[PDB]
Write a protein that binds this DNA or RNA. Structure first.
Ligand code: ZN
Length: 461
RNA sequence: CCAGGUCUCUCGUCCGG
RNA sequence: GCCCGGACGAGAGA
């Protein structure tokens, strides 16, 4: 990923866009009950907590492009992945405008409570104004596609979310690219049957976890994996993606029967963003707020990992690779052990920055004991060993609970945290509820006991 | 008064067969 | 009771 320029959008005939500038996160009724280090992330340059320059820090992730050509390991990667997808028999037809807008089996409607993006955002024009779920009316959208076309620029916003201390001081505030409504509709007409096929088929054929429910899928994964696990983290994954990876994506797309709309992928490469009083242009890198990013990132991840196993371990058999990705996140296995430090090595040469799983300082054997996916651990039930708990550490549930975006939500919020927490066991769970109830508002909250959630889980199988 | 993407899963409220 | 479905809200994850 890399910027190609920046300039007053006036220069290019684009409106100025008015980001909001106050966090929406305020302290919770439980802000002092529970400990934590995170706080809302920097939204502006005029933020007191800044220990460095803002706009410089947020655009820092675009680290340049290491490659542009698809070498023969990538090519074989492509060939192997596409071959797997072909087994799913993905419907390769355009999706009708109505289904693309309103949903079909496996694809949810567009989100009516979010922005319609450029230019609708400078026209004070909203999705609710354009979309009607009840009549599923396409006429107005069709008219806006005709009028404004596609390939619009993406509006940038800083993500209002909790951030650690050094990421606040460092102004490492993650960014968001609001895809235009025109472009989401277009992307969903082209790709919707692909998204649907993926959503319906989380596992090792797609190499993707999109569409899984960790409370249930965790019990599938160890079976799906080969004998020996390996994993690692990326630094700035989406932004470190070089054009060669996108080309290789297009190659998988041609290969599974989407050849005719691979031009859409080019637009995810050469993207124009409007951020406040400016405009810029990026080359490579995948815009986060776009349609299908979640699938495309998972797919590339599958290409990346295949590529490095072929580079590093000569003669490796890809038919015994079993991997599941969620965008950059991935858990992977193989019948014999593979060294992630060696994979990280080969990574360097494709612009990929790979570090040991879970911020550990050294690369170590990844085991069913230390492995994490979607931030959860894997722990066999004591009573039923074949059923696996997704175990998210209390640490992060503690961070979440200390804040609210609207105290009106306290019941839902805290109870949702309960669903994540109880997997930590009955003794940790009951201590959680003790704490919650340690303040009056906590005693107003209807919370489920361990045994109800446990039984709920067992039943769900 | 508003304002801040793409998705998945789940919970909750409410309404339905 | 069990199942299936819808609108809205929220949490987490990527
Ligand atoms: Zn340009």
């Amino acid at each position: 990923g890399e910027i190609q320029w920046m300039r007053p959008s006036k220069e290019v005939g684009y409106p100025i866009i008015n980001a909001p500038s106050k966090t929406k996160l305020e302290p919770s009724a439980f802000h002092y009950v529970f400990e934590g280090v995170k706080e809302p992330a920097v939204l502006t340059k005029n933020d007191p907590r800044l220990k460095t320059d803002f706009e410089e820090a947020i655009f820092s992730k675009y680290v340049g492009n290491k490659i542009t050509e698809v070498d023969e390991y990538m090519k074989e990667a492509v060939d192997h992945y596409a071959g797997q997808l072909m087994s799913l028999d993905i419907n390769t037809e355009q999706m009708c405008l109505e289904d693309a807008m309103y949903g079909t089996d496996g694809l949810e409607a567009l989100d009516l409570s979010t922005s319609a993006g450029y230019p609708y955002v400078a026209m004070g024009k909203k999705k609710r104004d354009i979309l009607n779920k009840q009549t599923r009316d396409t006429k107005e959208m069709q008219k806006l596609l005709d009028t404004y076309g596609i390939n619009l620029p993406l509006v940038t916003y800083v993500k209002d979310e909790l951030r650690s201390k050094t990421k606040v001081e460092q102004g490492k505030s993650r960014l968001i690219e609001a895809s235009s409504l025109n472009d989401s509709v277009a992307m969903r007409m082209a790709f919707g049957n692909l998204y649907a096929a993926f959503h319906k088929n989380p596992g090792v054929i797609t190499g993707s976890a999109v569409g899984c429910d960790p409370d249930l899928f965790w019990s599938k994964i160890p079976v799906l994996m080969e004998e020996k696990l390996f994993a690692f983290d990326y630094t700035g994954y989406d932004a470190s993606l070089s054009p060669a990876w996108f080309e290789a994506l297009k190659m998988v797309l041609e290969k599974i029967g989407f050849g005719d709309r691979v031009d859409y992928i080019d637009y995810l490469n050469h993207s124009h963003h409007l951020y406040k009083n400016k405009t810029y242009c990026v080359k490579g890198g995948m815009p986060s707020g776009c349609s299908g990013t979640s699938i495309f990132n998972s797919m590339i991840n599958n290409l990346i990992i295949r590529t490095l196993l072929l580079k590093t371990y000569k003669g490796i058999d890809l038919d015994h690779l079993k991997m599941i990705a969620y965008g950059d996140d991935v858990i992977a296995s193989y019948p014999h052990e593979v060294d992630a430090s060696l994979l990280a090595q080969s990574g360097k040469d494709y612009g990929l920055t790979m570090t040991p799983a879970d911020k550990s300082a050294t690369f170590e054997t990844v085991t069913w004991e230390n492995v994490t996916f979607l931030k959860r651990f894997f722990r066999a039930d004591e009573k039923y060993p074949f059923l696996i708990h997704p175990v998210m550490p209390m640490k992060e549930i503690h961070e979440s609970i200390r804040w609210t975006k609207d105290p009106r939500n306290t019941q839902d919020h805290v109870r949702s945290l309960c669903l994540l927490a109880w997997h930590n066991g009955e003794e940790e769970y009951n201590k959680f509820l003790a704490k919650i109830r340690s303040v009056p508002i906590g005693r107003a909250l209807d919370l489920p006991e361990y045994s109800t959630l446990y039984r709920r889980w067992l039943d769900s199988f």
